[PDB]
Scaffold this motif. Structure first.
Motif, PDB file in Angstrom:
ATOM      1  N   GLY A  67      -2.432  13.120  -6.862  1.00  0.00           N
ATOM      2  CA  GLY A  67      -2.220  12.060  -5.898  1.00  0.00           C
ATOM      3  C   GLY A  67      -1.977  10.723  -6.570  1.00  0.00           C
ATOM      4  O   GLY A  67      -2.481  10.472  -7.664  1.00  0.00           O
ATOM      5  N   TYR A  68      -1.191   9.869  -5.924  1.00  0.00           N
ATOM      6  CA  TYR A  68      -0.916   8.547  -6.470  1.00  0.00           C
ATOM      7  C   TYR A  68      -1.257   7.493  -5.429  1.00  0.00           C
ATOM      8  O   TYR A  68      -0.552   7.330  -4.431  1.00  0.00           O
ATOM      9  N   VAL A  69      -2.362   6.795  -5.671  1.00  0.00           N
ATOM     10  CA  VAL A  69      -2.843   5.760  -4.766  1.00  0.00           C
ATOM     11  C   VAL A  69      -2.462   4.369  -5.265  1.00  0.00           C
ATOM     12  O   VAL A  69      -2.891   3.951  -6.333  1.00  0.00           O
ATOM     13  N   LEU A  70      -1.644   3.658  -4.498  1.00  0.00           N
ATOM     14  CA  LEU A  70      -1.244   2.309  -4.878  1.00  0.00           C
ATOM     15  C   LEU A  70      -1.878   1.315  -3.897  1.00  0.00           C
ATOM     16  O   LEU A  70      -1.637   1.363  -2.683  1.00  0.00           O
ATOM     17  N   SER A  71      -2.707   0.429  -4.435  1.00  0.00           N
ATOM     18  CA  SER A  71      -3.415  -0.561  -3.639  1.00  0.00           C
ATOM     19  C   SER A  71      -3.294  -1.936  -4.310  1.00  0.00           C
ATOM     20  O   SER A  71      -4.162  -2.342  -5.077  1.00  0.00           O
ATOM     21  N   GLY A  72      -2.200  -2.642  -4.027  1.00  0.00           N
ATOM     22  CA  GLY A  72      -1.993  -3.946  -4.630  1.00  0.00           C
ATOM     23  C   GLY A  72      -1.660  -5.013  -3.605  1.00  0.00           C
ATOM     24  O   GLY A  72      -0.863  -5.906  -3.880  1.00  0.00           O
ATOM     25  N   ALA A  73      -2.294  -4.927  -2.436  1.00  0.00           N
ATOM     26  CA  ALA A  73      -2.060  -5.855  -1.336  1.00  0.00           C
ATOM     27  C   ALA A  73      -3.260  -6.743  -1.017  1.00  0.00           C
ATOM     28  O   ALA A  73      -3.448  -7.148   0.134  1.00  0.00           O
ATOM     29  N   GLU A 111     -14.091  17.715  -0.574  1.00  0.00           N
ATOM     30  CA  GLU A 111     -12.869  16.993  -0.893  1.00  0.00           C
ATOM     31  C   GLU A 111     -13.022  15.482  -0.955  1.00  0.00           C
ATOM     32  O   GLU A 111     -14.046  14.925  -0.569  1.00  0.00           O
ATOM     33  N   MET A 112     -11.985  14.830  -1.464  1.00  0.00           N
ATOM     34  CA  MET A 112     -11.940  13.381  -1.585  1.00  0.00           C
ATOM     35  C   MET A 112     -10.971  12.854  -0.534  1.00  0.00           C
ATOM     36  O   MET A 112      -9.816  13.267  -0.493  1.00  0.00           O
ATOM     37  N   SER A 113     -11.439  11.953   0.323  1.00  0.00           N
ATOM     38  CA  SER A 113     -10.568  11.381   1.341  1.00  0.00           C
ATOM     39  C   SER A 113     -10.212   9.953   0.940  1.00  0.00           C
ATOM     40  O   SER A 113     -10.947   9.302   0.194  1.00  0.00           O
ATOM     41  N   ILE A 114      -9.073   9.474   1.426  1.00  0.00           N
ATOM     42  CA  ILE A 114      -8.606   8.135   1.102  1.00  0.00           C
ATOM     43  C   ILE A 114      -8.079   7.481   2.359  1.00  0.00           C
ATOM     44  O   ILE A 114      -7.136   7.970   2.969  1.00  0.00           O
ATOM     45  N   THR A 115      -8.699   6.378   2.753  1.00  0.00           N
ATOM     46  CA  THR A 115      -8.262   5.672   3.945  1.00  0.00           C
ATOM     47  C   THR A 115      -7.637   4.337   3.557  1.00  0.00           C
ATOM     48  O   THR A 115      -8.164   3.618   2.710  1.00  0.00           O
ATOM     49  N   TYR A 116      -6.499   4.028   4.166  1.00  0.00           N
ATOM     50  CA  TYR A 116      -5.809   2.772   3.917  1.00  0.00           C
ATOM     51  C   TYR A 116      -6.168   1.838   5.064  1.00  0.00           C
ATOM     52  O   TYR A 116      -5.922   2.147   6.226  1.00  0.00           O
ATOM     53  N   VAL A 117      -6.767   0.703   4.728  1.00  0.00           N
ATOM     54  CA  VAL A 117      -7.193  -0.272   5.726  1.00  0.00           C
ATOM     55  C   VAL A 117      -6.438  -1.590   5.611  1.00  0.00           C
ATOM     56  O   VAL A 117      -6.303  -2.137   4.519  1.00  0.00           O
ATOM     57  N   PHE A 127      -3.538   4.896   7.494  1.00  0.00           N
ATOM     58  CA  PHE A 127      -3.281   6.261   7.050  1.00  0.00           C
ATOM     59  C   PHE A 127      -4.521   6.840   6.389  1.00  0.00           C
ATOM     60  O   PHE A 127      -5.369   6.101   5.900  1.00  0.00           O
ATOM     61  N   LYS A 128      -4.620   8.162   6.359  1.00  0.00           N
ATOM     62  CA  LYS A 128      -5.766   8.809   5.733  1.00  0.00           C
ATOM     63  C   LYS A 128      -5.425  10.222   5.296  1.00  0.00           C
ATOM     64  O   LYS A 128      -4.904  11.001   6.085  1.00  0.00           O
ATOM     65  N   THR A 129      -5.707  10.534   4.033  1.00  0.00           N
ATOM     66  CA  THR A 129      -5.465  11.863   3.474  1.00  0.00           C
ATOM     67  C   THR A 129      -6.680  12.357   2.708  1.00  0.00           C
ATOM     68  O   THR A 129      -7.630  11.611   2.474  1.00  0.00           O
ATOM     69  N   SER A 130      -6.628  13.620   2.300  1.00  0.00           N
ATOM     70  CA  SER A 130      -7.713  14.220   1.544  1.00  0.00           C
ATOM     71  C   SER A 130      -7.135  14.988   0.364  1.00  0.00           C
ATOM     72  O   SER A 130      -5.978  15.408   0.387  1.00  0.00           O
ATOM     73  N   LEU A 175       0.860  -1.181   0.000  1.00  0.00           N
ATOM     74  CA  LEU A 175       0.000   0.000   0.000  1.00  0.00           C
ATOM     75  C   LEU A 175       0.899   1.234   0.000  1.00  0.00           C
ATOM     76  O   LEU A 175       1.880   1.287   0.731  1.00  0.00           O
ATOM     77  N   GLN A 176       0.572   2.216  -0.830  1.00  0.00           N
ATOM     78  CA  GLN A 176       1.363   3.433  -0.902  1.00  0.00           C
ATOM     79  C   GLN A 176       0.532   4.631  -1.295  1.00  0.00           C
ATOM     80  O   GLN A 176      -0.478   4.511  -1.995  1.00  0.00           O
ATOM     81  N   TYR A 177       0.970   5.791  -0.824  1.00  0.00           N
ATOM     82  CA  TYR A 177       0.356   7.047  -1.209  1.00  0.00           C
ATOM     83  C   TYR A 177       1.482   8.015  -1.526  1.00  0.00           C
ATOM     84  O   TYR A 177       2.326   8.273  -0.677  1.00  0.00           O
ATOM     85  N   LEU A 178       1.507   8.535  -2.747  1.00  0.00           N
ATOM     86  CA  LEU A 178       2.517   9.507  -3.148  1.00  0.00           C
ATOM     87  C   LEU A 178       1.783  10.733  -3.707  1.00  0.00           C
ATOM     88  O   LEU A 178       0.608  10.651  -4.068  1.00  0.00           O
ATOM     89  N   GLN A 179       2.463  11.872  -3.761  1.00  0.00           N
ATOM     90  CA  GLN A 179       1.841  13.094  -4.265  1.00  0.00           C
ATOM     91  C   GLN A 179       2.930  13.985  -4.865  1.00  0.00           C
ATOM     92  O   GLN A 179       3.867  14.357  -4.170  1.00  0.00           O
TER      93      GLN A 179
END
Ligand SMILES: *[C@@H]1O[C@H](CO)[C@@H](O[C@@H]2O[C@H](CO)[C@@H](O)[C@H](O)[C@H]2NC(C)=O)[C@H](O)[C@H]1NC(C)=O
Ligand SMILES: [Fe+3]
Ligand SMILES: [Fe+3]
Ligand SMILES: [Zn+2]
Ligand SMILES: [Zn+2]
Length: 300
Positions: A231-237, A278-284, A292-295, A221-225
């Protein structure tokens, strides 16, 4: 209310019975618990739907054993899935995954790449999502020893998808615009950034005001900006967890905001909520905790 969805990738179990893994089942369970609490409008798949060689035809038993029966909780019933293809799916029959859309109501994969348009309740907020097929753009990473998609198999096919996306982006009136693909633009893990996407896709993002790019492929899991605010959301887990941080030096300084790839972890996914502000993103994590959580601001 708001538009809500789960983004999970690389969840395709295994080739031998029962055709699912402990991690895939743990993530399915926690996806159900998340839905029971927050609710969800749909689930997005970021590729690598069936390991390790995709499916043979639309009647393949893997559809029931790796997908239908894994995400079988009562809470997940009736929730639409919007699919995209990864490199392992391309080692098999992708037409079969598209045709399966006519066999299963929840499974929506109309073609290799397509546009989705959502309208959030009450709010005048609109959301557009472009599901891409990065294998058709960069080639199959399994075809090269370096494990990097060096070049597309067909020029016309790649050139056409890029022309389609550029024209779609230069006309999108939506308040939020997301783009998704299997391969990563930016990533600090095992495979790292995909040269082809950095040179051919990334430029389009800031130019047309794309909110974020979603992807999988690297198993974590990754979040880059970047500096332009994308934003760059990586969800491959969803099925594996690779600890590697091998390419962190290959990613521009400051971009990495979040990362988790502990091998002892059961995996994880992301929960996205798009609202009027805004758009929020939660990593579970599959275990049940939010890491983690960002907007991200609304598009001007
Ligand atoms: C890939 O999967 C698709 C979907 O099952 C296959 O399409 C079938 O093609 C045959 C002709 O050979 C038709 O009679 C069927 O009606 C098609 N099925 C559907 C759902 O359209 C396709 O043949 C597969 N390709 C390979 C190489 O196996
Ligand atoms: Fe994968
Ligand atoms: Fe992959
Ligand atoms: Zn890999
Ligand atoms: Zn880390």
């Amino acid at each position: 209310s708001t538009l809500r969805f789960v983004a999970v990738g690389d969840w395709g179990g295994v080739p031998n019975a029962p055709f699912h893994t402990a991690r895939e089942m743990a993530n399915a369970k926690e996806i159900a618990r998340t839905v029971q609490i927050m609710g969800a409008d749909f689930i997005m798949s970021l590729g690598d739907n069936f390991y390790f060689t995709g499916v043979h035809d639309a009647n393949d038993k893997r559809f029931q054993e790796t997908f239908e029966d894994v995400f079988s909780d009562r809470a997940l019933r009736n929730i639409p899935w919007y699919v995209l293809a990864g490199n392992h799916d391309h080692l098999g029959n992708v037409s079969a995954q598209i045709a399966y859309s006519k066999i299963s109501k929840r499974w929506n994969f109309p073609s290799p790449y397509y546009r989705l348009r959502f309208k959030v309740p009450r709010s005048n907020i609109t959301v557009a999502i472009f599901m891409l097929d990065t294998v058709m753009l960069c080639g199959n990473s399994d075809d090269f020893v370096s494990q990097q998609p060096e070049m597309p198999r067909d020029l016309g096919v790649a050139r056409t998808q890029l022309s389609w996306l550029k024209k779609q982006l230069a006309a999108a009136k939506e308040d939020y615009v997301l783009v998704a693909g299997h391969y990563p633009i930016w990533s600090i893990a095992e495979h790292g950034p995909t040269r082809c996407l950095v040179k051919n896709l990334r430029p389009l993002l800031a130019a047309y005001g794309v909110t974020a790019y979603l992807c999988g492929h690297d198993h974590n899991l990754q979040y880059l900006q970047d500096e332009n605010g994308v934003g760059y959301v990586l969800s491959g887990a969803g099925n594996f967890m690779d600890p590697s941080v091998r390419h962190q030096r290959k990613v521009p300084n400051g971009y990495l905001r979040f990362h988790y790839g502990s091998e002892d972890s059961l995996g994880g996914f992301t929960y996205v909520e798009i609202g009027s502000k805004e758009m929020s993103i939660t990593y579970v994590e599959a275990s049940g905790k939010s890491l983690f959580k960002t907007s991200l601001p609304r598009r001007p």
